[PDB]
């Protein structure tokens, strides 16, 4: 095992590239990093609990893990009020102790185990060229991923349910008894346009849809796991792909980049799997809340909000979407596809109903709209809330903003990693990753371009 | 032998004067479509209701613009993020009014430049090159995707994307500053470091190589004729350039390895433009620049201004006047 650049040809800043053909040390690096991930989860949850005022909204306190635990239906009641501090602390303690175990295991394999696992066992020994063993490891990880999806399903169906922001009576921890097993709905979520009003899979709007999709995902992942364990890669796959460790890393980097982009869009737009009681309003929710708040205020002042025309000729409070639905006016016309549990009571078949706006607005909807409008995901890097022209007195940046920004940056840099590693994998498998051979420089044997 | 294999060999040929490749089979149609629609729209598109308030903005040359003021105006705020192709319009005139050309040009352009980056990798692979020129090109691509796609997505409307014109770009930048305080954002500062340093180091590299050229011409002819294309030998004395630059600052501040110097020349503006692309992409989600407004108070509690407060006065003046007829409520939520 080379630990210097004369013995490896990799400098120290590329030094983990010395681990490419050292399987046991590579397993140790992974387990040690996994331990880092579980350590952050545990220690950050303990920090968030220690910095938690439970009578204060979670989105007001810069918390990102307690909303995730609360969305699963742990320690929360109707409208996201924290009934119990203890489940969040339990989740933190469990991750922190498992991380200690994982760090010990990673450090063992990285510093005292077999450096290569192929001289000890044929089960854990992997060669990157060995397509069958790598597909077996794919199959194992697929089986466990399907089990995790089914574990989420088990939590939502048989272990107290999850937080439904759309539940009648207001959002609450409810048990999903009828998940949609219909493949038309589940897989037509995949065929919906990734644009306005359709939103691809970001527009999943009910806990039944999410739980049925996770049953389908668990079934698909377990079936695919059994597939990669029982089959070898076919000739089209072997002829199209690069079969090397850097190649498999770059394939995973491309997938990770995709998933980080999707998560940023998911936390920015979806309020079903990211409920606004925990993550705060979305940008669309806050803009629609501002329009609704001033509709309510001016209606209380006697203004005819239907017949009120604005300075431009459009309605000041109510207008038509380009397909004709009755929507809020002002710049929020762009956010007319927003659906939220405080606003769907006032929506008729044609859009915002005039009768419901006239005589069915409840005080809790007014309170929720004012809170969401004043908690719009707008904030300075130093956490100063509101528009950037505001003075320094409101310490707020939405968790949706933090999560979307972070995961968009991570998705981009992991697309950069995919490009760097996909190109290097192709160059190294082709043999010119170290530069052009002077004697056999390929351009020197080509005809001139003109 | 097969027709498909003959087509594959033509597509992947290094003997094409312009390399096509499989990424080029997507690049060329999308870029030609975007180019043709951009030229036709820049000359002769009718005015576009960008703010969705029936206030159409003349963007094209035939409607009173010059080259500086001309733009392909972004699609309507009433559309928002909605997909608006030609076949979703009741007529071509409606499509033009609502800013459909911007959506067409921007979507085909973004596909085309992503395929340009893929094609750069593809040709480096066919030429036996190292593959990371496409990584350097991913910094302008990320910046273009930030201002044409990611900022509309975060703001929720393609009307918020940068206009395809010179004065439209200036309008985008000024509204960006008034709303996000991009100058106070450290990612933009890293971008300014990237472009200022990239130009600095371009001037340095060029000036040192031009300074240390080996005498191979007379004083009459241009010194560039001292280099022959495909010559084996070095055209300039790197050791002389290093001796000069390690006496200009000090010895250990100067590169002697040309490969480390060129990696630095590649890496500095690319990392700067990556950071500023991420800055614009994160102010898409309203994570704005630093707010130091009323940060200094006296012991009574009165606000003592700084330069950030004067900057905020400028930002307010830009904000209260922007999209003057589009706001109906007290806060510009997005």
């Amino acid at each position: 095992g080379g630990r210097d650049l004369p013995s490896t040809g990799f400098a120290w800043w590329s030094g983990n590239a010395r681990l490419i053909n050292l399987s046991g040390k590579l397993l140790g690096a992974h387990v040690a990093h996994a331990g880092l991930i579980v350590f952050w989860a545990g220690a950050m949850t303990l920090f968030e609990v220690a910095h938690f005022i439970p009578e204060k909204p979670m989105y007001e306190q810069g918390l990102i893990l307690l909303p995730h635990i609360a969305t699963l239906g742990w320690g929360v009641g109707p409208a996201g009020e924290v009934t119990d501090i203890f489940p969040f602390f339990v989740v933190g303690v469990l991750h922190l102790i498992s991380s200690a175990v994982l760090g010990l295991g990673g450090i063992y394999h990285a510093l005292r185990g077999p450096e290569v696992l192929e001289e000890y066992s044929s089960f854990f020994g992997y060669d990157w060229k060995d397509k069958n063993q790598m597909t077996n490891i794919i199959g194992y990880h697929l089986i466990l991923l399907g089990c995790g999806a089914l574990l989420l399903v088990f939590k939502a169906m048989f272990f107290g349910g999850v937080y439904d922001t759309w539940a009648p009576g207001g959002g609450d921890v409810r048990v999903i008894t009828n998940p949609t097993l219909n493949p038309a709905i589940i897989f037509g979520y995949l065929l919906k346009a990734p644009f306005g009003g359709e939103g691809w899979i970001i527009s999943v709007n009910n806990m039944e849809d999410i739980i049925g999709g996770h049953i389908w995902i668990g079934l698909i992942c377990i079936s695919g796991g059994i597939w990669h364990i029982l089959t070898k890669p076919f000739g089209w796959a072997r002829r199209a792909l690069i079969w090397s460790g850097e190649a498999y890393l770059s394939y995973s980097l491309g997938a990770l980049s995709l998933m980080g982009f999707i998560a940023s869009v998911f936390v920015w737009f979806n309020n079903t799997a990211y409920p606004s009681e925990f993550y705060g309003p979305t940008g669309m929710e806050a803009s629609q809340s501002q329009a609704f708040t001033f509709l309510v205020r001016d209606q209380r002042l006697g203004a005819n909000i239907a017949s009120a025309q604005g300075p431009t000729g459009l309605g000041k409070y109510l207008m038509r979407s380009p397909s004709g639905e009755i929507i809020f006016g002002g710049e929020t016309m762009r956010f007319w596809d927003f659906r939220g549990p405080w606003l769907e009571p006032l929506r008729g078949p044609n859009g915002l109903d005039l009768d419901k706006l006239r005589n069915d607005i409840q005080p809790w909807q007014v309170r929720r709209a004012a809170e969401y409008m004043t908690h719009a995901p707008l904030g300075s890097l130093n956490s100063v809330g509101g528009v950037i022209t505001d003075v320094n007195s409101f310490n707020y940046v939405s968790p949706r903003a933090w999560l979307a920004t972070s995961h968009f940056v991570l998705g981009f840099f992991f697309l950069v990693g995919h490009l760097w590693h996909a190109g290097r994998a192709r160059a190294a498998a082709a043999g010119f990753e170290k530069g052009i051979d002077r004697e056999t420089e390929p351009t020197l044997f080509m005809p001139d371009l003109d | 032998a097969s027709l498909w294999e003959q087509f594959c060999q033509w597509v992947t040929s290094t003997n094409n004067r312009i390399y096509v490749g499989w990424f080029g089979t997507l690049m060329i149609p999308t870029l030609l479509t975007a180019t043709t629609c951009f030229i036709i729209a820049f000359i002769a598109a009718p005015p576009v209701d960008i703010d969705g308030i029936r206030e159409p903005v003349a963007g094209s040359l035939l409607y009173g613009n010059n080259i500086i003021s001309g733009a392909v105006v972004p699609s309507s705020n009433a559309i928002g993020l909605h997909f608006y192709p030609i076949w979703e319009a009741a007529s071509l005139d409606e499509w033009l009014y609502n800013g459909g050309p911007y959506q067409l040009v921007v979507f085909h352009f973004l596909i085309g430049i992503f395929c340009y980056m893929g094609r750069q990798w593809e040709l480096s692979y066919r030429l036996g090159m190292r593959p990371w020129i496409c990584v350097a090109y991913s910094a302008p691509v990320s910046a273009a995707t930030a201002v044409f796609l990611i900022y509309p997505i975060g703001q929720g409307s393609f009307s918020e994307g940068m206009p395809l014109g010179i004065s439209g770009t200036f309008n985008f930048m000024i509204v960006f500053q008034a709303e996000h305080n991009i100058l106070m954002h450290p990612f933009h500062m890293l971008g300014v470091a990237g472009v200022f340093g990239g130009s600095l180091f371009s001037a340095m590299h060029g000036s040192l190589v031009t300074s240390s050229l080996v005498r191979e011409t007379t004083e009459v002819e241009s010194q560039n004729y001292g280099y022959k294309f495909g010559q084996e030998e070095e055209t300039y004395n790197i050791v002389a350039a290093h001796g000069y630059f390690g006496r200009l600052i000090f010895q250990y501040a100067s590169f002697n390895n040309s490969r480390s110097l060129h990696f630095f020349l590649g890496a500095w503006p690319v990392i700067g433009i990556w950071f500023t692309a991420m800055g614009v992409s994160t102010m898409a989600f309203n994570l704005n620049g630093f707010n130091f407004n009323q940060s200094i108070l006296d012991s009574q509690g009165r606000v003592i201004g700084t330069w950030a407060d004067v900057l905020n006065r400028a930002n307010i003046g830009f904000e209260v006047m922007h999209e003057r007829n589009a706001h109906n409520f007290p806060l510009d939520l997005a």
């Binding site: 001139d448 371009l449 003109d450 | 312009i18 000359i43 040359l61 035939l62 010059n66 080259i67 001309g70 022959k228 294309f229 495909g230």
Partner: peptide, 30 residues
């Protein structure tokens, strides 16, 4: 009528681009 002048100068730049690509001096190894 300024539109004609703008079209001419943009067309001159694009024609220069075409003739510089299609009819460059070929780089020759010698």
């Amino acid at each position: 009528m300024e539109s004609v002048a703008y079209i001419l100068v943009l067309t001159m730049a694009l024609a220069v681009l075409f003739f510089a690509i299609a009819f460059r001096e070929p780089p020759r190894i010698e």
